[PDB]
Paper text:
The structure was further refined and modelled to 1.55 Å resolution using a good quality native protein dataset. The rBPSL1038 crystals contain two protein molecules per asymmetric unit forming a symmetric homodimer. The structure of each rBPSL1038 protomer adopted a modified βαββαβα ferredoxin fold. The long β4 strand (residues 61–71) contains a kink at residue T67 that results in a sharp curved shape. One end of the β4 strand (residues 61–67) from one protomer forms an anti-parallel β-sheet with the end of the β4 strand (residues 68–71) of the other protomer, assembling the dimerization backbone of the BPSL1038 dimer. Overall, protomer A has a well-ordered fusion 6xHis-tag (13 amino acids) at the N-terminal region with residues -11 to -8 forming an additional β1 strand. The β1 strand forms an anti-parallel β-sheet with strand β4. Both subunits (residues 1–87) are highly similar with an r.m.s.d of 1.3 Å over 87 Cα atoms (residues 1–87); the biggest deviation was observed at loop L4 and helix α3 regions and is likely due to the existence of the fusion His-tag β1 strand that interacts with the β4 strand of protomer A. In BPSL1038, the aspartate (D11) pair is 5.9 Å apart and located together with the S32, S33 and T34 residues at the β2-β3 turn that forms a negatively charged cage for coordinating a water molecule that is tetrahedrally hydrogen bonded to residues S33 and T34 from both subunits. Further structure analysis revealed that the rather flat and wide potential substrate-binding surface of BPSL1038 provides a suitable platform for dsDNA binding. The side chains of four BPSL1038 solvent-exposed positively charged amino acids (R10, R30, R54 and K57) from each subunit are systematically oriented on the potential substrate binding surface, with the negatively charged cage formed by the D11SST motif located in the middle.
BPSL1038 is a protein with 88 amino acids encoded by a gene annotated as hypothetical in B. pseudomallei. The overall structure folded into a modified βαββαβα ferredoxin fold similar to known Cas2 nucleases. Functional analysis revealed that BPSL1038 is a nuclease with endonuclease activity towards double-stranded DNA. An active site with a unique D11(X20)SST motif was identified and proposed for BPSL1038 and its orthologs.
Numbering used by the authors:
A (entry chain A): -13 to 87
B (entry chain B): 2 to 87
Amino acid sequence: HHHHSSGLVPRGSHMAGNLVIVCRDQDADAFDQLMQEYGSFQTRLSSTAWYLNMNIVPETLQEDILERVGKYTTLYIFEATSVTYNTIDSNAAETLSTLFG
Amino acid sequence: AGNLVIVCRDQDADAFDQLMQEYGSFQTRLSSTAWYLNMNIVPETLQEDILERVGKYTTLYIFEATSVTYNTIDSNAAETLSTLFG
Ligand code: NA
C-alpha cells in the first residue's frame, strides 16, 4: 500500500486545528526556520508547504508569521478537513499517519 | 465547488504544473509545488488521475480546505482565491 487518507479528526493527541501553510519559493528557508519552532506538530511537505496540527486561528498565525518574516511576505494559510496522499518513503509514511492521525 | 490544495515534491514541480493546466482558470499556482483548485472532484479520483499520469511512485498531498487567509504579491492567486473560494 502507498495511498492513504485521513479526516484529520480531533480525537486524542490530534489537535483540532489542521493547517496548510504555503509560501513562495523565495522565502522557503525562512519559513522553514519558523516552522521548526512548532516541533513534532508540523511536517514539511515540500520546500514551500507545511502541514501544522495546532489550535490556532489562521488569521492569528498569519499575523505571527508576518511579524517575523515581514509584512510584505506572501503566504497562504488553509484550514484543512481531510488529506489524501501517496508516498513510497516507508519512513515518511509512518511520520505521516501519526501526524495526520 | 470543493476547495482543494495540491502539493508535490520539488522534483515533480514541472510535471504537476503541466497536469494542473487542464483545470484552466479554476486552479492557481501558489508556489513551484503547491496549487489551489476549485473543482467538484473526489480527492481519491484526483489522486488516481495524477498517479496514472505522473507515475505510481509519485509523492502527493491533496487537502480539502474549508478556509483560507492569505497575503500575496501574485495577482492571479489573489483573484482566484477571492473569487472562487467562498
Ligand atoms: Na485521466
